[PDB]
Amino acid sequence: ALCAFKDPYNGTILCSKGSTCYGLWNLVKQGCWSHIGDPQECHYEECVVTYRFCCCSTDLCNVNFTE
């Protein structure tokens, strides 16, 4: 997937085919999420916070979050 990218240490990053996207919020960090084996961990097209962290599966899904 293509994910939004932010690392405080064009603002996107190409992640491997099996990866998801994450965001951490002010925005702190965004990039590739690599966990596998838990389909409930990351949502699909929405980055949903259930700090404010979420991971999601579709291109640029990590640009914003919902609660």
TrEMBL record:
It comes from the Eukaryota. This is Bone morphogenetic protein type II receptor. Disulfide bonds join C15-C32, C42-C55, C47-C54, C56-C61. It is found in: Membrane. It comes from Rattus norvegicus. The lineage of its organism: Eukaryota, Metazoa, Chordata, Craniata, Vertebrata. The gene is BMPR-II. Residues 10-64 form the Activin types I and II receptor domain. The chain holds residues 1 to 94 of 144 of the full protein.
